[PDB]
Structures are given as C-alpha cells and as structure tokens.
Enzyme design. Structure first.
Site: not given
Ligand SMILES: Nc1ncnc2c1ncn2[C@@H]1O[C@H](COP(=O)(O)OP(=O)(O)OP(O)(O)=S)[C@@H](O)[C@H]1O
Ligand SMILES: Nc1ncnc2c1ncn2[C@@H]1O[C@H](COP(=O)(O)OP(=O)(O)OP(O)(O)=S)[C@@H](O)[C@H]1O
Lengths: 351, 192, 350
Positions: B67, B96-97, B121, B170
């Site tokens: 997010g 990612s996060m 990513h 990605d």
C-alpha cells in the site's frame, strides 16, 4: 561416631527410593555429633550449623524418616507441628512449647537438651498466601516465620521447668538454641506452577511460542529438582527464614517399581500387617507377584503416594474379612491378580 | 464477524475478542492494504507492548498486498527504535511494502511459510501539473527509491547494485529462495 | 584510655567487610557514649543528647554480626533482645520491662552500671503498623508506644531476682534517659515504597522513560535515598522515628566483598570447614577460581551471605558421605568445575 553408610543402611530398611534425601540427613547427623563431640576450642570457632529443608510429594515418607531417625538416634528427638504455633503468646500455642516438649523426652536436662534434634511437619501451612506482605497480621502465617528467625540462628528462651507446682515459683529456665539443629519440611502445594513460569517462559499462542508438546509434561518430580530459593519467595516464604535454612533436600515421587518393593522389603509393609492380623486367627495370607504389578498401576492413578495404597487392598479384602470369622476350617487364603480387578473371587484353602 | 473467547484467570473469567487475546500475548496482525489508519493503529500496539515488557519478543504476522509507502515507513522506524526484537512471519503474500517490514525484523528471527510468496518492485506514483512541479515530485520519489534500496541491502546483506537490478520490475520470490536471498533466516514447516 | 575510632573500626574490619559507612557511625556513637558518661556532664554543655541509631539493611548483610562483635570489644553491659515476643498492655507473652530485667543479669544488678549499657533489638520491621485493624495489633502500634517511654527516658518497675515470695512485693527503678538503644532490622518491601517516589512513573510514550532493564534502582543504591517520610508509609509512627535521628544504609553484597569474606574473617565458612576436617586428619584447599563462581551462584539466590552454605554443602555432600568410609585420605582439593557439578572433587592419598 556412627558412619553415614551405617546410619543409611538402617534407614534403607524402612525407606526405599529416597537415596538423595538419606545422604543429606546422614551428613547432618554426622556433622551434629562432630560439632558437639569436639571441645570446639580450635582456631576455627563458632562452627556453622546447616539446617535441612525437606521437600517432596505427599506420602513420600517425610514423616516416616523422623520417626525412624529417633529410634536410632541417641541424642533427644522431638516431633512437633507448625499448625498449632501462634506468635506473640496468643491462646493457640507458643514457640517455647517446642523446647518444653524436648525436655519431656530429655528428662529436663538443659545441657543435654541443647544438643537435641527437632522436626517440624507441615511447614508449608505457615506460608504466605500472596507474595506481598499480608494487609492484616497473620497469626499462623508470616508471623510464625518471623518468630523462628532468632530461634534457628540462636537465642535464649524462657522454659517453665516441670510446669511448676503453683503460682509460687513463677520462674522460667533459659536454654540456648545456637547449637540446636532444625529439620523443617513439608509437602508444598502449588509449587510446580510457580517454577514452570520461571523455568519455561512459554505461555504463548503464536507460531514462535513453544506450546507444551503434550498434555502431560513437566512432571512434578522434575520441577523440584530445579528448585531455588527465589522460587519460594513468590510462594510466600520470607528470604530471612530461607536464609536460616540453606540446605534444600528433594524427594522424588514414588515409582511403580518402588511400591512393589515397599510391600515386601520393609518390615511395616501392608502385606506384613494383614499377615500378622490373620496369623493370630490361625489363617495365612499370600500375595503373588502378578498381583503387585497391577496394584502399582492403580496406586499412581490416585495421586496420593504410598498412603493411598491401603485403599486398593482393603477394598478387595472387604468381603473376605467379613466372611472369614464366620467360616471354619480355613487355613490359607490366596489373592490372585484377577481379584484386584474385581472380576474374580479369592481362592480359599481348607484343612 | 469477530468471535468472542473466554480467558480463565485467578481473579475470574474475562471475555476477550480473538484479536485482543493475541495482543495480550504480544501478537499483532497486519491485514489488508497499508493505509494511514491501519498503520497508525499498529504503532500504538507496539508502544503498548514495550511498556508492559521491553524484554519479550514481539511477533508480527504480515499478509497484505502492500500500500502507501509513507504509512509503512512510520512502522520501520518504530520497530528499529524500540529495544524488543520484532519477529516477522510472512503468511500468504508480501508485496513491496509488506516485504520491507518483513526484512526489517530482528536478525535471526525472520521466518516465511513453505507456500508463502514475496513480491518486490519500485515505488509507484504520478502527478499532473506544470513541468516545474513534476520535477519536484520526481526528485522526491527518486530519493525514496534510493533510500528503500539502501535499507533493503542493509537487512538482506546483498549489495546495492543487486537491489537496483532486481527492483527495476516486479520480481516474485518463493519461500525457499528468500532464505538463499538473505531476506529471511529459516522456514517454519512443522512444529518441533 | 578509651579506644579511638580508628582502633575500634580496625577491630570490626577483622570480622566485617564492606560496611565502611556503617562502621564509622557505630564507632562514633560508641566513642560518644563512652565520652558522654565518663565526664561528670556538669560542664558548659549540660543534658547532652543521645543519638539513637536505626540499622536498615538487606538480608544477610551483617547487621546481627556487628552487634555480637561490638559487645565483645566493649566493657559496659550489652543485651540482645528481640521485638517478636514483645506484647503491649502487659500480656502473657512478654513485656518491654523484661529487657531491663535481662540487662541486669549481665550487669549483676548494678543500676549505676546498667544505665551506661547498650541495647540491641532485631526484627524491628515486624512491629510495623497495619492499615487493617481486625483484632480484639498487640505486636504492632502498641509496642511502639511502650518503647517511646523507654527511649525518651523514664524508670520502669523491675522485680529484682523475681523475689522469694509475695512477701517482698517490691521493684527497682532504673532510669533509661542515659541508656543507648540500637533498634535495627531488615525491612521487606521498602524498595517499592521508595521506588514510587524516585521512579516518577513509567510513561508509555516516546519521551517518557521506561524500565528498559529487568532490574533497576538497586537495593544498595536505593536505600541510600531513604528518608523518614518514606518510613511513615511503611507503617512506623513519626514519633518513634523522631527518637532515632541517625540512619545507616547497608549495601547487600559486592562480588569482590564475598571473596574477602571467605578468607580474611576468622569465622569464615572456609576456616570453619577447614577446622572441621582438621580433626579428621584431612586438609582442605579452595582455589580462587572456585570462589568467583560461588559468588555468582550466591547472588542468584538473593539471600546474602547466609545463603552461601547452600552452595558449599551442595558440592561436598557426596564427599562428606564417602569421606569417613574412605581411608588413607590426607588432602582434598576443590576446583571450579566441582561447584557446577560437572566434575568430582579431587582427593590425595598418603
Ligand atoms: N519410602 C517409603 N517406604 C515405605 N513406605 C513409605 C515410604 N514413604 C512413605 N511410606 C508410607 O507412607 C506413610 C506416611 O509417610 P509420610 O512420612 O507421612 O510421608 P509424608 O511425605 O510425610 O506425607 P505428609 O507430608 O506427612 S502428609 C508411611 O507410614 C508408610 O506407610
Ligand atoms: N560483612 C560480612 N562479613 C562476613 N560474614 C558476614 C558479613 N555479613 C554477614 N555475614 C554472615 O551472615 C551471618 C548473619 O549476618 P546478620 O548480621 O544476621 O545479617 P542481618 O542483616 O542481621 O540479617 P538478618 O536481618 O538478621 S536475617 C553472619 O553470622 C556471617 O556469617
């Protein structure tokens, strides 16, 4: 003069499976004789006295040791209890009563009484209910431990000699306790829960936390082996009292194989008791080895120790003892393994 | 719906929700998209556990598709600031996060489930306006991308050059590869 | 002439270690007491005050040891009473005047010689006040009021020798204004009361400080910050504390201090056990590596020096059980591994 091996050999006749406990007491007995027998006028002075704290499950034989020890012990011995003791001279009982009880066995010999040995059963009863000091003043809890501090370390206490003929005398005798040994031991309840919190962190629900592998884990016997004084602080005992008792013995819980030996090797075994009960009646009794293996499984299930052993025997022989006196020409009785389970009847032999 | 359970205590029985019961045992759940409300709630949970006990390990389960970046960076500084070791576990997915908070856990206390999957990513963004404003937001997001790669290398141990090539697009990493990549320490296949 | 603080302190150093602050206080009081009474007191300064010392110390820190060694060096009468048996309103347990009657036994019933005596009381914490009062506190607040009269200075009736019968029906008066009193006992839970004051709370936020470490506000360093107002919350009445202005704080134990306690003092356990085996014709040795490990195990028990015998007896247990049976054994050596239990103590035959 008596040797640890000789004194232990005598206790082995009456006690089984408590090898570690026997060592602790034997050394104390030998040390006590050694401390007193020597003049003490040596370079080292005021030799320390190591008291003993006995811990073990219920019915493991703590009280039995005190009785058998007094038989072989030459110096005076007494068997008091911490249930009736009350602090500050209340109506219940005083701490000096323990000393007064000793003189009855010692025939009022002060010099001979100071070298005596003392035993106190059910020491756990005076333990504080909570870790924090009681809001009120407990008369049979923390308060009693406080009054024993100066006694175990050494002090002088008033003792009415012979009770006195009348109010006329109104005097008391002073006796020392610096040399007196103390054996304070009792089966503690709930001690396993405290040690578990401090030994195994656990108490988690997530993945990383290690939940107990089985429902039955961390047995009661194992936890006592890893006991320390800090654990007793959470239990309720004051560090001051524990400092007066450096030694801490441990009695492993009874094992199925030990109980079989308890019924045959000891002189006061239940088998020998009933055998003598029917001996006067002109009737013999027999107990096969196959019956003892089944009884061991039943006894441990009761979680009561050796004292819960009579329930298994007497529940079987109930009917038998009721019909034997009425019966005539009965010379021998046999109790096979099936009888214990309740699926059979004891075989009878007639003359 | 949320089920209610009963926890037995010496004082008496107490009713707790399933999420509150686990919080009592130093367990926090990170579910769904990372936003300002969900992130600001987790920070209060971590601080509350620090005061109750600063020497007991905390367990953080992550199952989220990622997010907002700024909401997640507040958690990263918090986990590193406090003394307790923040254990991280990956359940289902780690974007990612979500992957950055996973690797940010205490060294040696990072695990991934046998069938979990991680994806990493570069930051996503966009802007509409004058060219002068686009240059400002472009330089800003570029620093974050550079900053996020430096920290990824710090915890994973890899070189910054390797992180730059692998984060250009990605990249999905299975659970065993995560161990070989230095992102995690081991796999919790079965209970021992 | 009377001994000097350096000479009297040197004697305590032989039997006590790590109580420098306390030793000076006691030496000064002793020096003042000898100095106070030796002089006629009819000087520029009259009706000199008496400083009463209150000894606070953790368990096994050496409080009781100081009173015993102190009595040996001093010539004046000394008594070792206890606050456990004291009962208010003259109950059957014990009275406060009994201490005086016991004092005369040591002084051979000499009133002028008894007023210059010293008094020692232990387990003072046991007589603290309790908030809840369900009773019909005979050992609490009541005992404090009875002592106040003794400390302030008054005469108490004491039957000399108990009397042959009712015929005598008399008692001797013995002033107490000049008598010194040392009332000290290890207080339990005092750290928690002081902790609330000095901690300043534990805020949960970022700026607020929390107990980062498991332990904090070490008992030895915490008792130094003690004040009379804190003792009021514990239960003591301010009037009783007012009579005892002096206060001495004792550090529980120092890892290095423990090493000295086993060698320098004459009554050390090592010398006790060494003499125990001397009569048996066997010698004992203790390596320095073993004493360092014993200190770590002793501190873990949180029992002070009194909890040290548990560590020693736990090791030598097996030895003492098989030592008398063994023959031709002339020396025993204890290594560091023996304490942990991994190894067995070495023996030397001859
Ligand atoms: N080692 C043993 N060998 C034989 N009988 C034993 C043994 N230990 C206990 N018993 C039996 O248990 C009875 C009571 O033992 P106790 O000494 O009372 O045990 P205990 O640990 O003292 O339990 P408490 O605390 O007194 S209720 C004895 O009379 C024996 O019949
Ligand atoms: N500084 C010390 N040096 C040597 N031995 C010490 C020292 N302090 C304490 N001990 C030992 O501890 C024993 C008892 O010490 P105590 O004076 O009773 O301590 P305490 O502060 O009075 O504890 P309480 O309150 O009486 S339980 C002494 O007989 C010594 O063996």
């Amino acid at each position: 003069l008596p040797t640890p091996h000789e004194i232990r050999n005598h206790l082995d006749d009456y006690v089984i499976g408590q090898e570690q406990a026997k060592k602790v007491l034997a050394v104390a007995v030998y040390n006590h004789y050694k401390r007193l027998r020597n003049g003490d006028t040596s370079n080292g002075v005021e030799l320390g006295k190591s008291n003993i704290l006995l811990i073990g499950p219920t019915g493991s034989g703590k009280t039995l040791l005190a009785e058998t020890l007094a038989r072989l012990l030459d110096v005076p011995f007494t068997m008091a209890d911490a249930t009736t003791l009350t602090e500050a001279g209340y109506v219940g009982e005083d701490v000096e009563n323990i000393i007064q009880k000793l003189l009855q066995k010692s025939d009022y010999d002060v010099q001979k009484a100071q070298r005596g040995i003392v035993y106190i059963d059910q020491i756990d009863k005076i333990s504080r209910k909570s870790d924090n000091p009681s809001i009120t003043r407990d008369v049979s809890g923390e308060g009693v431990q406080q009054a024993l501090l100066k006694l175990i370390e050494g002090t002088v206490a008033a003792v009415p000699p012979q009770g006195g003929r009348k109010h006329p005398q109104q005097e008391f005798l002073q006796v020392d306790t610096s040399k007196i040994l103390f054996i304070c031991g009792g089966a503690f309840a709930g001690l396993d829960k405290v040690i578990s919190h401090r030994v195994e962190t656990g108490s988690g629900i997530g993945f990383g936390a290690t939940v107990k592998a089985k429902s039955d884990k961390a047995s009661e016997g194992e936890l006592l082996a890893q006991v320390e004084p800090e654990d007793l602080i959470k239990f309720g005992l004051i560090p001051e009292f524990i400092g007066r008792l450096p030694v801490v013995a441990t009695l492993n819980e009874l094992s199925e194989e030990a109980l079989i030996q308890i019924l045959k090797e000891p002189k006061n075994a239940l088998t020998k008791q009933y055998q003598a009960l029917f001996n006067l009646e002109g009737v013999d009794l027999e107990f096969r080895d196959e019956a003892l293996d089944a009884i061991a499984k039943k006894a441990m299930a009761r979680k009561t120790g050796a004292r819960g052993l009579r329930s298994i025997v007497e529940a079987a022989l109930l009917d038998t003892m009721y019909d034997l006196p009425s019966m005539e020409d009965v010379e021998k009785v046999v109790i096979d393994e099936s009888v214990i389970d309740g699926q059979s009847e004891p075989l009878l032999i007639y003359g | 719906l949320v089920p209610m359970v009963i926890e037995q205590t010496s004082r008496g029985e107490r009713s707790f929700d399933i999420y509150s019961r686990l919080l009592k045992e130093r367990v926090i759940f990170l579910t769904g998209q990372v936003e300002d409300h969900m992130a600001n709630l987790i920070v209060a949970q971590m601080l509350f556990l620090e005061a109750e006990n600063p020497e007991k390990d905390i367990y953080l389960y992550i199952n989220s598709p990622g997010g907002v970046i700024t909401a997640g960076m507040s958690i990263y500084d918090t986990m590193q600031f406090i003394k307790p070791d923040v254990s991280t576990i990956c359940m289902g997915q780690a974007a990612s996060m979500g992957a950055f908070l996973l690797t940010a856990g205490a060294k040696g206390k990072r695990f991934c489930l046998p069938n979990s999957r991680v994806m990493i990513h570069q930051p996503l963004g966009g802007y509409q306006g004058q060219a002068t404003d686009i240059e400002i937001h472009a330089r800003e997001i570029l620093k974050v991308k550079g900053r996020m790669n430096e920290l990824m290398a710090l915890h994973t141990g890899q070189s910054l050059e390797q992180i730059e090539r692998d984060t250009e697009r990605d990249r999905f990493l299975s659970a065993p590869e995560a161990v070989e990549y230095g992102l995690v320490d081991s796999i919790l296949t079965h209970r021992n």
